């Protein structure tokens, strides 16, 4: 109970930095990078018992994942990578690791003031995306 309460709700993207380079590092192709980078998703985070659901909705794609913290799952990403994902809570930060083809990327979400800040890291490339409550 009360797992992730400060993350629950509906969030809207308000800024992005370094996201094209992050996607390039991950291996996303040119056309998908351009359309995805233009996207202004809403992110809807909910909890029911031990299950967390994260939906991301935009003109580019609508995605949905549901998971239990610490319990790996298979994910098909917005670029159609088949990845093995594990999401944990570490010190208040939601940490999402995706593994595929001997590669790994981490997406970290944290509450800062009234924002939800998202840090995407692939090797030495980091992108920061900031969301506000809808
Ligand atoms: N639904 C959407 O428009 C959408 C927008 C961005 C992503 N996204 C994030 C978002 C992190 C966050 O901001 O929480 C990290 C990596 C991706 C990605 C992966 C592959 C790809 F080809 C395009 C984007 C995923 C869905």
Coordinates of N, CA and C and ligand atoms in Angstrom, one line a residue:
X1 N 0.8 -1.2 0.0 CA 0.0 0.0 0.0 C 0.8 1.2 0.0
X2 N 0.2 2.4 -0.4 CA 0.9 3.6 -0.7 C 2.2 3.4 -1.3
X3 N 2.2 2.7 -2.4 CA 3.4 2.5 -3.2 C 3.3 3.5 -4.4
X4 N 4.4 4.3 -4.5 CA 4.4 5.3 -5.5 C 3.4 6.4 -5.5
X5 N 2.8 6.8 -4.3 CA 1.7 7.8 -4.3 C 2.1 9.0 -5.0
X6 N 3.3 9.5 -4.8 CA 3.6 10.8 -5.4 C 3.9 10.8 -6.9
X7 N 3.9 9.6 -7.5 CA 4.0 9.4 -8.9 C 2.6 9.3 -9.6
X8 N 1.6 8.8 -8.8 CA 0.3 8.6 -9.4 C -0.3 9.9 -10.0
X9 N -0.9 9.7 -11.1 CA -1.7 10.8 -11.7 C -1.4 10.9 -13.2
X10 N -1.8 12.0 -13.8 CA -1.7 12.3 -15.2 C -0.7 13.4 -15.4
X11 N 0.3 13.2 -16.2 CA 1.4 14.1 -16.4 C 1.5 14.5 -17.8
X12 N 2.0 15.7 -18.1 CA 2.1 16.2 -19.5 C 3.6 16.6 -19.7
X13 N 4.2 16.3 -20.8 CA 5.6 16.7 -21.1 C 5.7 18.2 -21.3
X14 N 6.6 18.8 -20.6 CA 6.9 20.2 -20.8 C 8.2 20.5 -21.4
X15 N 9.2 19.7 -21.2 CA 10.5 19.9 -21.9 C 11.2 18.6 -22.1
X16 N 12.1 18.7 -23.0 CA 12.9 17.6 -23.4 C 14.4 18.1 -23.7
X17 N 15.4 17.5 -23.3 CA 16.7 17.9 -23.8 C 17.5 16.6 -24.1
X18 N 18.3 16.7 -25.1 CA 19.2 15.6 -25.5 C 18.5 14.3 -26.0
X19 N 17.2 14.4 -26.3 CA 16.4 13.1 -26.5 C 16.8 12.5 -27.8
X20 N 17.0 13.3 -28.9 CA 17.4 12.7 -30.2 C 18.7 12.0 -30.0
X21 N 19.7 12.5 -29.3 CA 21.0 11.8 -29.1 C 20.8 10.6 -28.3
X22 N 19.9 10.6 -27.3 CA 19.6 9.4 -26.5 C 19.1 8.4 -27.4
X23 N 18.0 8.7 -28.2 CA 17.4 7.7 -29.1 C 18.5 7.2 -30.1
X24 N 19.3 8.0 -30.6 CA 20.3 7.6 -31.6 C 21.2 6.6 -30.9
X25 N 21.6 6.8 -29.7 CA 22.5 5.9 -28.9 C 21.8 4.6 -28.7
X26 N 20.5 4.6 -28.5 CA 19.8 3.4 -28.3 C 19.7 2.6 -29.6
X27 N 19.6 3.2 -30.7 CA 19.6 2.6 -32.0 C 18.3 2.9 -32.8
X28 N 17.6 3.9 -32.4 CA 16.3 4.3 -33.0 C 16.7 4.9 -34.4
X29 N 16.0 4.5 -35.4 CA 16.2 5.1 -36.8 C 15.7 6.5 -37.0
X30 N 16.2 7.1 -38.0 CA 16.0 8.5 -38.3 C 14.5 8.9 -38.2
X31 N 13.6 8.2 -39.0 CA 12.2 8.7 -39.1 C 11.5 8.6 -37.8
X32 N 11.7 7.5 -37.1 CA 11.1 7.3 -35.8 C 11.6 8.3 -34.8
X33 N 12.9 8.7 -34.9 CA 13.5 9.7 -34.0 C 12.8 11.0 -34.2
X34 N 12.6 11.4 -35.5 CA 12.0 12.7 -35.8 C 10.6 12.8 -35.3
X35 N 9.7 11.7 -35.5 CA 8.4 11.8 -35.1 C 8.2 11.6 -33.6
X36 N 9.0 10.8 -33.0 CA 9.0 10.6 -31.5 C 9.5 11.8 -30.8
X37 N 10.5 12.4 -31.4 CA 11.0 13.6 -30.7 C 10.1 14.8 -30.7
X38 N 9.2 14.8 -31.7 CA 8.1 15.8 -31.8 C 7.0 15.5 -30.8
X39 N 6.9 14.3 -30.3 CA 5.8 13.9 -29.5 C 5.7 14.7 -28.2
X40 N 4.5 14.9 -27.7 CA 4.3 15.6 -26.4 C 3.4 14.7 -25.6
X41 N 4.0 13.6 -25.1 CA 3.1 12.6 -24.4 C 2.5 13.1 -23.1
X42 N 1.4 12.5 -22.8 CA 0.9 12.4 -21.5 C 1.2 11.0 -20.9
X43 N 1.6 11.1 -19.7 CA 2.0 9.9 -19.0 C 1.0 9.7 -17.8
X44 N 0.4 8.5 -17.8 CA -0.6 8.3 -16.8 C -0.1 7.1 -15.9
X45 N 0.1 7.4 -14.6 CA 0.7 6.4 -13.7 C -0.4 6.1 -12.7
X46 N -0.7 4.8 -12.5 CA -1.7 4.3 -11.6 C -1.2 3.1 -10.8
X47 N -1.8 2.8 -9.7 CA -1.4 1.7 -8.9 C -2.7 1.0 -8.4
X48 N -2.7 -0.3 -8.5 CA -3.8 -1.1 -8.0 C -3.2 -2.3 -7.3
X49 N -3.2 -2.3 -6.0 CA -2.5 -3.3 -5.2 C -1.0 -3.2 -5.5
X50 N -0.4 -4.3 -5.8 CA 1.0 -4.3 -6.1 C 1.3 -4.0 -7.6
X51 N 0.3 -3.8 -8.4 CA 0.6 -3.6 -9.8 C 0.6 -2.1 -10.2
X52 N 1.6 -1.7 -10.8 CA 1.8 -0.4 -11.3 C 1.5 -0.4 -12.8
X53 N 0.8 0.6 -13.3 CA 0.5 0.7 -14.7 C 1.1 2.1 -15.1
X54 N 1.8 2.2 -16.2 CA 2.3 3.4 -16.8 C 1.8 3.4 -18.3
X55 N 1.0 4.4 -18.6 CA 0.6 4.6 -20.0 C 1.3 5.8 -20.5
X56 N 1.7 5.8 -21.8 CA 2.2 7.0 -22.5 C 1.5 7.2 -23.7
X57 N 0.8 8.3 -23.9 CA -0.1 8.6 -24.9 C 0.3 9.8 -25.7
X58 N 0.4 9.7 -27.0 CA 0.7 10.8 -27.9 C 0.3 10.6 -29.3
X59 N 0.5 11.6 -30.1 CA 0.2 11.4 -31.6 C 1.1 10.4 -32.2
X60 N 2.3 10.1 -31.6 CA 3.3 9.2 -32.1 C 2.9 7.7 -31.8
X61 N 2.6 7.5 -30.5 CA 2.2 6.1 -30.1 C 1.5 6.2 -28.8
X62 N 0.6 5.2 -28.6 CA 0.1 4.9 -27.2 C 0.7 3.6 -26.7
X63 N 1.4 3.7 -25.6 CA 2.0 2.5 -25.0 C 1.4 2.3 -23.6
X64 N 1.5 1.0 -23.1 CA 1.0 0.7 -21.7 C 1.9 -0.4 -21.2
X65 N 2.4 -0.3 -20.0 CA 3.1 -1.4 -19.3 C 2.5 -1.5 -17.9
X66 N 2.4 -2.7 -17.5 CA 2.0 -3.0 -16.1 C 3.0 -4.0 -15.5
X67 N 3.4 -3.8 -14.2 CA 4.4 -4.6 -13.6 C 4.4 -4.5 -12.1
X68 N 5.1 -5.4 -11.5 CA 5.3 -5.4 -10.1 C 6.8 -5.1 -9.8
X69 N 7.1 -4.2 -8.9 CA 8.4 -3.8 -8.6 C 9.3 -5.0 -8.4
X70 N 10.5 -5.0 -9.1 CA 11.5 -6.0 -8.9 C 11.3 -7.2 -9.7
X71 N 10.2 -7.3 -10.5 CA 9.8 -8.6 -11.2 C 9.9 -8.3 -12.7
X72 N 10.9 -8.9 -13.3 CA 11.1 -8.7 -14.8 C 9.9 -9.0 -15.6
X73 N 9.9 -8.4 -16.7 CA 8.8 -8.6 -17.7 C 9.4 -8.3 -19.1
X74 N 8.8 -8.9 -20.1 CA 9.1 -8.6 -21.5 C 8.2 -7.4 -22.0
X75 N 8.9 -6.5 -22.6 CA 8.4 -5.2 -23.1 C 8.7 -5.1 -24.6
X76 N 7.7 -4.6 -25.4 CA 8.0 -4.2 -26.7 C 8.0 -2.7 -26.7
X77 N 9.2 -2.1 -27.0 CA 9.3 -0.6 -26.9 C 8.6 0.1 -28.1
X78 N 8.6 1.5 -28.0 CA 8.0 2.3 -29.1 C 8.7 2.1 -30.4
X79 N 10.0 1.7 -30.4 CA 10.7 1.4 -31.6 C 10.7 -0.1 -32.0
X80 N 9.9 -0.9 -31.4 CA 9.8 -2.3 -31.6 C 11.0 -3.1 -31.2
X81 N 11.9 -2.6 -30.2 CA 12.9 -3.5 -29.6 C 12.0 -4.4 -28.6
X82 N 12.5 -5.7 -28.6 CA 12.0 -6.6 -27.6 C 13.0 -6.6 -26.5
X83 N 12.6 -6.1 -25.3 CA 13.5 -6.0 -24.2 C 13.0 -6.7 -23.0
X84 N 13.9 -7.0 -22.1 CA 13.6 -7.5 -20.8 C 13.8 -6.3 -19.8
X85 N 12.7 -6.0 -19.1 CA 12.6 -4.8 -18.3 C 12.4 -5.2 -16.9
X86 N 13.0 -4.4 -16.0 CA 12.8 -4.6 -14.5 C 12.7 -3.1 -14.0
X87 N 11.7 -2.9 -13.2 CA 11.5 -1.6 -12.6 C 11.4 -1.7 -11.1
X88 N 12.2 -0.9 -10.4 CA 12.4 -1.0 -9.0 C 12.2 0.5 -8.4
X89 N 12.0 0.6 -7.1 CA 12.0 1.8 -6.5 C 13.3 1.9 -5.6
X90 N 14.2 2.8 -5.8 CA 15.5 3.0 -5.2 C 15.5 4.3 -4.6
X91 N 15.4 4.4 -3.2 CA 15.5 5.7 -2.6 C 14.5 6.7 -3.1
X92 N 13.3 6.3 -3.4 CA 12.3 7.2 -3.9 C 12.2 7.4 -5.4
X93 N 13.2 6.8 -6.1 CA 13.3 7.0 -7.6 C 12.9 5.7 -8.3
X94 N 12.0 5.8 -9.2 CA 11.6 4.7 -10.0 C 12.6 4.4 -11.1
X95 N 13.2 3.3 -11.0 CA 14.4 3.0 -11.9 C 13.9 1.8 -12.9
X96 N 13.9 2.1 -14.2 CA 13.5 1.2 -15.2 C 14.7 0.8 -16.0
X97 N 15.1 -0.5 -16.0 CA 16.3 -1.0 -16.8 C 15.7 -1.8 -17.9
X98 N 16.1 -1.6 -19.1 CA 15.8 -2.4 -20.3 C 17.1 -3.1 -20.8
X99 N 17.0 -4.4 -21.1 CA 18.1 -5.1 -21.5 C 17.7 -5.8 -22.8
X100 N 18.6 -5.7 -23.8 CA 18.5 -6.4 -25.1 C 19.8 -6.4 -25.8
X101 N 20.0 -7.6 -26.5 CA 21.2 -7.7 -27.4 C 22.5 -7.3 -26.7
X102 N 22.7 -7.7 -25.5 CA 23.8 -7.3 -24.7 C 23.9 -5.9 -24.4
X103 N 22.9 -5.1 -24.6 CA 22.9 -3.6 -24.4 C 22.0 -3.4 -23.1
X104 N 22.1 -2.2 -22.5 CA 21.2 -1.8 -21.4 C 21.0 -0.3 -21.5
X105 N 19.8 0.1 -21.1 CA 19.4 1.5 -20.9 C 18.6 1.7 -19.7
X106 N 18.7 2.8 -19.0 CA 18.0 3.0 -17.8 C 17.2 4.3 -17.9
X107 N 16.0 4.3 -17.4 CA 15.1 5.4 -17.4 C 14.7 5.6 -15.9
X108 N 15.1 6.7 -15.3 CA 14.8 7.0 -13.9 C 13.8 8.1 -13.8
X109 N 12.8 8.0 -13.0 CA 11.8 9.0 -12.7 C 11.8 9.4 -11.3
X110 N 11.7 10.7 -11.0 CA 11.7 11.2 -9.7 C 10.8 12.4 -9.6
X111 N 10.3 12.6 -8.4 CA 9.6 13.8 -8.1 C 10.5 14.9 -7.6
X112 N 10.4 16.1 -8.2 CA 11.2 17.2 -7.9 C 10.3 18.4 -7.9
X113 N 10.1 19.0 -6.7 CA 9.1 20.1 -6.6 C 7.8 19.6 -7.2
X114 N 7.0 20.3 -8.0 CA 5.8 19.8 -8.6 C 6.0 19.1 -9.9
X115 N 7.2 18.7 -10.2 CA 7.5 18.1 -11.5 C 7.8 16.6 -11.3
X116 N 7.7 15.9 -12.4 CA 8.2 14.6 -12.5 C 9.3 14.6 -13.6
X117 N 10.5 14.3 -13.1 CA 11.7 14.4 -13.9 C 12.2 13.0 -14.4
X118 N 12.4 12.9 -15.6 CA 12.8 11.7 -16.3 C 14.2 11.8 -16.9
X119 N 15.0 10.9 -16.4 CA 16.4 10.8 -16.9 C 16.6 9.5 -17.7
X120 N 16.9 9.6 -19.0 CA 17.2 8.5 -19.8 C 18.6 8.4 -20.1
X121 N 19.3 7.3 -19.9 CA 20.7 7.1 -20.0 C 21.0 5.9 -20.9
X122 N 21.9 6.1 -21.9 CA 22.4 5.0 -22.7 C 23.9 5.4 -22.8
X123 N 24.7 4.5 -22.3 CA 26.1 4.6 -22.2 C 26.4 6.0 -21.6
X124 N 27.1 6.9 -22.3 CA 27.4 8.2 -21.8 C 26.4 9.3 -22.2
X125 N 25.3 9.0 -22.8 CA 24.3 9.9 -23.3 C 23.2 10.0 -22.3
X126 N 22.9 11.1 -21.8 CA 21.7 11.3 -20.9 C 20.8 12.4 -21.4
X127 N 19.5 12.1 -21.4 CA 18.4 13.0 -21.7 C 17.5 13.2 -20.6
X128 N 17.1 14.5 -20.4 CA 16.2 14.8 -19.3 C 14.9 15.4 -19.9
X129 N 13.8 14.8 -19.4 CA 12.5 15.1 -19.8 C 11.7 15.5 -18.6
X130 N 11.0 16.6 -18.6 CA 10.3 17.2 -17.4 C 8.8 17.1 -17.7
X131 N 8.1 16.6 -16.8 CA 6.6 16.6 -16.9 C 6.0 17.4 -15.7
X132 N 4.9 18.0 -15.9 CA 4.0 18.7 -15.0 C 2.7 18.0 -14.9
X133 N 1.9 18.2 -13.8 CA 0.6 17.6 -13.7 C -0.3 18.2 -14.8
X134 N -1.1 17.3 -15.4 CA -2.0 17.7 -16.4 C -3.2 18.5 -15.8
Ligands
LIG1 N1 4.2 7.4 -26.5 C1 5.2 8.3 -26.8 O1 5.1 9.2 -27.6 C2 6.6 7.9 -26.3 C3 7.5 8.9 -26.3 C4 8.8 8.6 -25.8 C5 9.2 7.4 -25.4 N2 10.5 7.1 -24.9 C6 10.9 7.4 -23.6 C7 10.0 8.2 -22.7 C8 10.6 8.4 -21.4 C9 9.6 9.3 -20.6 O2 9.5 10.5 -21.0 O3 9.0 8.8 -19.6 C10 12.1 6.8 -23.4 C11 12.4 6.2 -24.6 C12 11.4 6.3 -25.5 C13 11.4 5.9 -26.9 C14 11.9 4.7 -27.2 C15 11.9 4.2 -28.5 C16 11.4 5.1 -29.5 F1 11.4 4.7 -30.8 C17 10.8 6.3 -29.3 C18 10.8 6.7 -27.9 C19 8.2 6.3 -25.3 C20 6.9 6.6 -25.8

